[PDB]
Paper text:
Inherited missense mutations in the myocilin (MYOC) gene, within its olfactomedin (OLF) domain, constitute the strongest genetic link to primary open-angle glaucoma via a toxic gain of function, and thus MYOC is an attractive precision-medicine target. Myocilin has no known function, and there is no glaucoma phenotype in Myoc knockout mice or in individuals with a homozygous N-terminal truncation mutation or hemizygous deletion of MYOC, but rare non-synonymous coding mutations lead to toxic intracellular sequestration of misfolded myocilin. However, not all mutations in MYOC cause glaucoma, and common variants are expected to be neutral polymorphisms. Among the common features associated with pathogenic myocilin misfolding, we demonstrate that a single metric, OLF thermal stability, can robustly segregate benign from early-onset disease variants.
Overall, nine variants (T256M, R296H, L303I, S313F, V329M, S331L, E352K, A427T, and V499I) were considered likely to be benign. Similarly, V329M, a substitution that occurs in the hydrophobic interior of OLF, is not sterically compatible. Previous support for the V329M variant as benign comes primarily from the observation that methionine is the corresponding residue in Danio rerio myocilin, but the mutation has also been documented among glaucoma patients, including one diagnosed with juvenile OAG. Assessment of spent media from cells expressing each of the 16 full-length myocilin variants revealed WT-like secretion for T256M, R296H, L303I, S313F, V329M, S331L, T353I, A445V, V449I and K500R. Structural integrity was further confirmed by high-resolution crystal structures, which were solved for 11 OLF variants. No gross changes from WT OLF were detected for the structures of T293K, R296H, L303I, V329M, S331L, E352K, T353I, K398R, A445V, V449I or K500R, indicating that these mutations are accommodated within the native five-bladed β-propeller fold and do not perturb the dinuclear calcium-containing site. Surprisingly, V329M does not appear to harbor any pathogenic signatures despite its location in an internal strand associated with amyloid formation and its involvement in a hydrophobic patch that is disrupted in other disease variants like W286R. In addition to the five variants that we predicted initially to be benign (T293K, T353I, K398R, A445V and K500R), our study reveals seven more (T256M, R296H, L303I, V329M, S331L, E352K and V499I) that are indistinguishable from WT OLF across multiple assays. Thus, our data indicate these should also be considered benign.
Numbering used by the authors: 244 to 502
The structure:
Amino acid sequence: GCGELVWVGEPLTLRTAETITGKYGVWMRDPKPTYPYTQETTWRIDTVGTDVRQVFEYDLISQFMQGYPSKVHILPRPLESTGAVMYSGSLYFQGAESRTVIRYELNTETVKAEKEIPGAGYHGQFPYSWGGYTDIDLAVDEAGLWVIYSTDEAKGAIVLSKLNPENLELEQTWETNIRKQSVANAFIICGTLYTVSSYTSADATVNFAYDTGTGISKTLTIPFKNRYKYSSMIDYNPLEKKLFAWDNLNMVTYDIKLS
Ligand SMILES: [Ca+2]
Ligand code: NA
């Protein structure tokens, strides 16, 4: 049931980090879960600092919300920023101080693929407006895996590419007119890129859309609340049909409605 985004609900807090290491981070579920995981499995990465390698895994939502991890994975190289996603059994993340995306299969703890995103800025060239080295943002939608970035040729405007999830080859690329550094974050729903106007405001908006199927850009005014005033991560999960976000220690989720 695809369509255009028309409404975002109030943020619901599912878990709050207890230390500064989790001021910013990424949490996520796999929209294409594979053995030994299920649609309830949740992963959490607290991303403050310079040697981020611990991935917390929770078999059950109850454990994610109230308990300790059921397993901790140690990544084979440090991860950069908050843009990572889970897809079909693999964590897709950016290597620290690089433009390299790594496909890391959690059940075997093996690197299955690596790819330098051609021309992508990294390490503070084209971050979102809050900084945080957020130059490269992976995304999953109804059609699969994407990457959101920019390049010198695009003059800092958001570029998005569809990725082959097995080998990380770029399959198609689109260039928007939206300055990446001017928006707080972005995500993709049903092939349309959406941006958020501010990471601090209780009265932010989903403010731009770019439809990859038609090439048309639009402005929007859909209200979006940053309840804790510092949103470092905003992604869409196409299985739950919800936004997942990280806001100033808090792992939150927003309902949505599509036309
Ligand atoms: Ca995002
Ligand atoms: Na992401």
